[PDB]
């Protein structure tokens, strides 16, 4: 009753819970091996860990859809649902949860300033932003890199590439929270109402953002060019999108790159013997950030919803199944990664990972997130070779889809 006993864990399966939130690709090793594709009562889920079904149903966005990519977890309580009223909250779709034919296509098919020499210029920034932060922290002996330099250059990054101008920082921050906690996490009934104020302000945020960007089209950056396709094409790139795009990307076009640089560090200062290969061969940092994409990515975790019945490896899908593809887990697969626990940093298919997902949805700007990751971790293996982790407790924020630890304390000369 082995297997009848992980039936029973897979039906109980809560994604916040200690093993999950501990290590999400370890919480599902046995699944992995023997119950690969599982419904879990406790979140209303399929859960999907291998690499090949991960992959299949991302191949496929007509059978399974990326509707609910950003549908908000847990339903509201309904107090929460009329904060959202006070703000005439009105989220619908982007482009990562835009299902369509072409719809999704036609809009992401024209909208490309992801061009080699935007991002060509976009990286000499990131260069200065990284070459200035450590300046100012190079002399102490300890430091909390996130604090110092991994949340807060990826945000300037974004609103950098996006038209977007800077301002309180820190109150983008807890806005970008709002939307995470609120969409994958599960808020307790004391957050439940802030975080609806959180969120509901910031859809009014970057309605005012949007407002002025419209009124001076002189404007260069990602989001002057949506606004701009949008008064050639209002039929595929919305206003609504225009709103909804403006919010969700605010987040997502810094968010998973500032916790996977943290994820990389991480892993890299933790092993010494790969940390003076970086060290002595900077040459490798593509390959190494590849290997930490694959190994601890920043998204463990996406969504897919089921529009016809269906069938993965064995298991058919109502019309209306919620899964959750889970990335950290396919990406330790062993059937397809040998050593898959392991931080190999050449591993050859490496990239074959799935953490900016696969084919349509296939994740714009997993360029700039690599061209981030590989800069933090030239700058710090170049001038501090000596850095180490210190002793630390991590801790991560509870939710279902993104990872990176709060703090990264470290020290040097
Ligand atoms: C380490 C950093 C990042 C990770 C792990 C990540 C992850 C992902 C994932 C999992 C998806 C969905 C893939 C799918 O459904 O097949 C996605 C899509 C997307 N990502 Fe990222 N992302 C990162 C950084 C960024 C940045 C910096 C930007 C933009 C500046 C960005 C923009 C987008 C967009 C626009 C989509 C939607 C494209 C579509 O729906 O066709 N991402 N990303
Ligand atoms: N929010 C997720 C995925 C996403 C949202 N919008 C586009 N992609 C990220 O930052 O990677």
Redo the contacts with the bound molecule.
């Keep these: 009753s082995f297997h009848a006993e992980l039936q029973q864990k897979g039906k109980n399966f809560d994604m916040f819970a200690v093993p999950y939130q501990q290590d999400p690709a370890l919480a599902l090793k046995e699944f992995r091996a023997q119950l690969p594709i599982f419904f879990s009562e406790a979140m209303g889920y399929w859960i999907v860990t291998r690499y090949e079904d991960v992959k299949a149903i991302?191949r496929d966005?007509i059978t399974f859809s990326?509707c609910n990519?950003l549908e908000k977890l847990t339903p509201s309580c309904p107090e929460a649902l009329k904060i959202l009223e006070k703000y005439k909250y009105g989220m619908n779709r982007?482009?990562?949860?835009?299902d369509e034919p072409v719809h999704?296509?036609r809009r992401?098919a024209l909208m490309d300033a992801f061009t080699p020499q935007n991002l060509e210029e976009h990286q000499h920034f990131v260069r200065e932003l990284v070459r200035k932060k450590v300046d100012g922290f190079i002399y102490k002996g300890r430091a909390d890199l996130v604090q110092e330099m991994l949340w807060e250059i990826?945000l300037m990054?974004?609103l950098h590439?996006?038209g977007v101008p800077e301002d309180d920082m820190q109150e983008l921050r807890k806005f970008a929270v709002a939307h995470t906690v609120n969409t994958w996490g599960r808020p307790t009934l004391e957050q439940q109402l802030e975080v609806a104020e959180g969120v509901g302000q910031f859809w009014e945020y970057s309605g005012r953002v949007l407002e002025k960007m419209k009124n001076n089209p002189e404007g260069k950056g990602?989001m002057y060019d949506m606004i701009a396709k949008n008064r050639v094409m209002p039929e595929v790139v919305t206003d609504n999108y225009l709103h909804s795009?403006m919010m969700a990307?605010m987040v997502?076009?810094?968010?998973?790159?500032a916790?996977?640089?943290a994820n990389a560090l991480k892993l890299l200062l933790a092993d010494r013997k790969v940390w003076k290969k970086i060290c002595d061969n900077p040459q490798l940092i593509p390959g190494a950030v590849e290997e930490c994409?694959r190994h601890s990515?920043?998204?463990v975790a996406?969504r897919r919803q089921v529009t016809t019945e269906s069938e993965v490896s064995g298991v058919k899908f109502r019309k209306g199944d919620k899964l959750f593809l889970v990335?950290a887990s396919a990406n330790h697969d062993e059937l397809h990664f040998e050593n898959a626990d392991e931080l190999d940093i050449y591993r050859d298919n490496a990239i074959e990972h799935?953490?900016?997902?696969?084919?349509?949805?296939?994740?714009?700007?997993?360029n700039?997130?690599?061209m981030?990751?590989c800069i933090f971790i030239e700058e710090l293996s170049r001038r501090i070779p000596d850095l180490k982790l210190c002793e630390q407790e991590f801790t991560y924020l509870a939710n279902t889809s993104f990872r990176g630890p709060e703090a990264l304390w470290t020290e040097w000369q």
Excluded: D
Aim: proline share 4%; hydrophobic share 50%.
């Design positions: 991302f966005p990326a990519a982007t482009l990562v949860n835009e999704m296509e992401r990826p990054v974004a590439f996006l990602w795009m990307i997502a076009a810094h968010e998973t790159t916790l996977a640089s994409l990515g920043s998204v996406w990335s799935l953490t900016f997902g696969y084919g349509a949805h296939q994740c714009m700007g997993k700039i997130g690599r981030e990751m």
